[PDB]
């Protein structure tokens, strides 16, 4: 049993990208899907699809990288530099609308889960709601 499936998914993505994998399988759930959809729309991942591994649901996530680089270490820039759980089981952070944080001066995102659904920071402000602060990504 994963103790925090969301943190687990984010971490899988992190590890995956850090070795420049083309894709990564996370065990599937609705909530994970919503978080993904947000990433995909934001451009951090190419996309994701549903797939059955050992006849079990998984979300396969297609990662995204930079162009090849020059000099020593040709390895390309990451599209996801930073992916981090904020609210965790055992400390759950919830923010009001006035408290939804601007991430990397706007270049990043924060993902919130709200009673309007899973939004980004901008989405939540424009919708005027707060909620649980899920993760930072930039």
Closest residue to Mg ion, based on beta-carbon distance: 22
- Per-residue x/- track, 72-91, RNA (CB under 7 A): ------------xx--xxxx
User: In this chain, which of 3, 68, 70, 72 binds RNA, going by CB under 7 A?
Assistant: 3
State how far the Cα of 81 lies from the Cα of 93, in Å rounded to an integer.
23
Q: Is 5 exposed, middle or buried (0-12, 13-18, 19+ CB in 10 A)?
A: middle
State how far the Cα of 127 lies from the Cα of 108, in Å rounded to an integer.
19
Binding site for RNA (CB under 7 A): 1-5, 7-8, 10-12, 14-16, 18-19, 21, 24, 27-32, 34, 55-57, 84-85, 88-92, 94-98, 113-118, 128-132
């Amino acid at each position: 049993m994963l103790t925090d499936p969301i943190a687990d998914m984010l971490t899988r993505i992190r590890n995956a990208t850090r070795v420049y994998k083309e894709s990564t399988d996370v065990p599937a759930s609705r909530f994970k899907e919503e978080i993904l959809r947000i990433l995909a729309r934001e451009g951090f991942i190419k996309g994701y699809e549903r797939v059955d591994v050992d006849g079990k649901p998984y979300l396969r996530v297609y990662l995204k990288y930079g162009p090849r680089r020059q000099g020593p270490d040709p390895r390309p820039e990451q599209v996801i530099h930073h992916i981090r759980r904020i609210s965790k089981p055992g400390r759950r952070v919830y923010v009001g609308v006035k408290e939804i944080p601007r991430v990397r001066r706007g270049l990043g995102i924060a993902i919130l889960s709200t009673s309007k659904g899973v939004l980004t920071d901008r989405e939540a402000r424009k919708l005027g709601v707060g909620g649980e602060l899920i993760c930072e990504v930039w």
